[PDB]
Design a protein around this ligand. Structure first.
Ligand code: AGS
Ligand code: MG
Lengths: 150, 194
């Protein structure tokens, strides 16, 4: 709000002492236990850029596994990251992005690998049809969608 | 005559730099607590204590205001860096009734019987030790029932039946019981004084 207002033209200590300190005292029931803690470190939820970075980390993890175990150069556009961010749940956190990548991307990769539609050395671009779809590449103008049967 | 001269020299040394100043080097504030503990240990060291019943303290207050620190410095005053004469016992380990075996060993015919007790061994090593039952309230009250024999008369019979005289010991019991009440009453008295 302040940013868009200026364009038109950190957790505070009071929150820790007034909100979080009574909740910690209520749960742990002992201020002697809390006073021994040097740093009560606060982990905040993810911003949208951090969600895109999490999707890129998960897709890079599966790309490294595909390159090492099988030699399948996996690729994807930024629209793939924007699509997979929609499966993010604030309550579950980064685990929601891992489950969404395993649902949309890696189940298709496993079904393609079982069907032998992914030989060694082949490139593979995840593309938004929003449904993600795999696309194997061989030349500079060949991108056939992999027909993964049931 | 040499023993009397050594006693007078030790008395002059204690009068030159008593436990109150030595605690005020480390402890800040707590002048009532330092005065109480200093008067009690002065009564003990000058021979004006009943030798039958050991001296027993209960340090009450909020968290991190020098209970365990004053107990540690009391032990360092009485015994210097000698670790034998400072029998620390973190009583938050004693949260169940059956944890008295750490004090008094184990009976005949059970595991750990040959090793005997831990506190009774440490008090055999130093009868006049400063036993710090730190966080005594966090133990089971039935575990604190073992301290009745050890506070009224300074005795604690182990699993092997061997009683140890602990009458010269200075038992100290840190606790946060009524910490909120003591803190609120002290803040109320300071507000009334202001
Ligand atoms: N009055 C004091 N003057 C100087 N240092 C202090 C004082 N009170 C506490 N400290 C420091 O606090 C640290 C540990 O404090 P303790 O000795 O645990 O106090 P406490 O009141 O036992 O409370 P607890 O948490 O409920 S067991 C030590 O490093 C001491 O140096
Ligand atoms: Mg303590």
């Amino acid at each position: 709000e302040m940013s868009r207002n200026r364009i038109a033209e950190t957790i505070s200590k009071n929150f820790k002492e007034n909100v979080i300190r009574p909740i910690l005292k209520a749960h742990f029931r002992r201020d002697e236990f809390l006073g021994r803690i040097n740093e009560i470190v606060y982990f905040l939820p993810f911003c949208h850029s951090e969600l895109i970075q999490l999707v890129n980390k998960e897709l890079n993890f599966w790309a490294k596994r595909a390159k090492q175990r099988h030699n399948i150069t996996l690729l994807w556009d930024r629209e793939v990251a924007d699509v997979l961010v929609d499966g993010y749940n604030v309550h579950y956190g980064a685990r929601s992005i891992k489950h969404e990548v395993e649902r949309r991307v890696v189940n298709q990769l496993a079904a393609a690998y079982e069907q032998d539609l992914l030989p060694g050395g082949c490139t593979l671009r995840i593309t938004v049809e929003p449904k993600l779809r795999l696309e194997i590449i061989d030349k500079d103008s060949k991108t056939r969608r992999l027909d993964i049967r049931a | 005559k040499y023993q009397e001269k050594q006693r007078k020299r030790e008395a002059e040394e204690r009068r030159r730099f008593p436990l109150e100043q030595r605690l005020k080097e480390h402890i800040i504030g707590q002048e009532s607590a330092i005065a109480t503990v200093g008067a009690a240990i002065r009564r003990k060291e000058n021979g004006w204590y009943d030798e039958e019943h050991p001296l027993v303290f209960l340090f009450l207050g909020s968290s991190g205001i020098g209970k365990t620190e004053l107990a540690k410095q009391t032990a360092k005053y009485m015994h210097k860096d000698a670790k034998k004469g400072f029998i620390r016992l973190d009583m938050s380990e004693f949260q169940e009734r059956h944890e008295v075996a750490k004090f008094i060993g184990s009976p005949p015919g059970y595991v750990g019987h040959e090793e005997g007790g831990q506190l009774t061994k440490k008090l055999k090593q130093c009868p006049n030790a400063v036993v710090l039952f730190d966080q005594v309230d966090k133990a089971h009250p039935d575990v604190l029932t073992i301290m009745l024999q050890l506070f009224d008369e300074g005795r604690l019979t182990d699993g092997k039946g061997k009683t140890i005289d602990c009458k010269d010991a200075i038992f100290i019991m840190t606790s946060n019981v009524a910490s909120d009440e003591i803190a609120q009453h002290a803040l109320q008295l300071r507000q009334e004084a202001l």
